[PDB]
Amino acid sequence: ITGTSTVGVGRGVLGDQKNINTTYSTYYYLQDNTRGNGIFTYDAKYRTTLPGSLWADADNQFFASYDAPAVDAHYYAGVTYDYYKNVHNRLSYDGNNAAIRSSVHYSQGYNNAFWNGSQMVYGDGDGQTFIPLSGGIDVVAHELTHAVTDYTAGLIYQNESGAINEAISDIFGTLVEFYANKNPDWEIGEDVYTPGISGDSLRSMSDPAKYGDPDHYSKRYTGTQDNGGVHINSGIINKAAYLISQGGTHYGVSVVGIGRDKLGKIFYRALTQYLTPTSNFSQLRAAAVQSATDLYGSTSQEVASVKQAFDAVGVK
Ligand SMILES: NNC(=O)CCC(=O)O
Ligand SMILES: [Ca+2]
Ligand SMILES: [Ca+2]
Ligand SMILES: [Ca+2]
Ligand SMILES: [Ca+2]
Ligand SMILES: [Zn+2]
């Protein structure tokens, strides 16, 4: 809407206070005009019709329990925008400052979040498996990264291409979590998963097998569940990315880590210059090797480490 840019304050899903960019015109709206063509957060009001109504608040204070998922969806979308702009010189998901739209309170007891082709959508969880899913910065950045992928490589959402699509979202979701530097880790969803169980998460990048996901190509899922295992076989690529950044010896193959910032540069270049809608794992290895070569040189440690990491997970 048309109005003047303002700064509200509220509390997120985990009870942390944060400032949020709003817009005033009669009400205060969750509309951040400081980033691109705006970040807009909507109330789906427990329904499944999208987007719902642009979030409106009478006093610019967002401390009600009902407000918390909106505060975090809005704030973490901003952090993710800042990551892509400051770290990769990318302006929003399309590279042209497209407006970023999110809806919260989607459905009833909904244990998921997604990018629907046009916007991000967050359930509240059932209170046992999940709390509201926008409480996880890695979740928010994972979802916005699906938009980045769709506008760049365009990896189709099935089989190996879809597992790459998933791993890209887990990788950048994790790199955004490190960028914000609040309790960062290589786990996915730990801040919103199972409020009754400490120390778990939905997936692990450092040890995918902790939750049953494969960490080697020989262990890949070959059936039809989960669109051909997109959230399962992503573990193979997640492990490779983790090794590239942090190093390790895995199935007897030693990898010298090169750090998160270089991991991000290599995979961002692979995503935006070399991957295609039907790329498979072997083609991702080639894309990553070429990206590291472009950035660091063919004889560089960075290139050598990319090769070792894909070797360690059995991807030639
Ligand atoms: N394809 N989308 C989903 O399965 C929702 C969760 C995710 O973002 O991966
Ligand atoms: Ca209020
Ligand atoms: Ca964390
Ligand atoms: Ca995490
Ligand atoms: Ca938990
Ligand atoms: Zn995903």
From Swiss-Prot:
Binding site for Ca(2+) 3: E177, N183, D185, E190
Biological processes annotated in GO: proteolysis
Broad class of where this protein is predominantly found: secreted
Catalysed reactions, as listed in the record: Preferential cleavage: Xaa-|-Leu > Xaa-|-Phe
Cofactor: Ca(2+); Zn(2+)
Catalytic residues (positions): E143, H231 (proton donor)
Residues the entry annotates as binding Ca(2+) 4: Y193, T194, I197, D200
Activity as a function of temperature: Thermostable.
GO annotations of cellular component type: extracellular region
Reported function: Extracellular zinc metalloprotease.
Family to which this protein belongs: Belongs to the peptidase M4 family.
Protein name: Thermolysin
Native source organism of the sequence: Bacillus thermoproteolyticus
Lineage: Bacteria, Bacillati, Bacillota, Bacilli, Bacillales
Residues of the full protein shown: 233 to 548 of 548
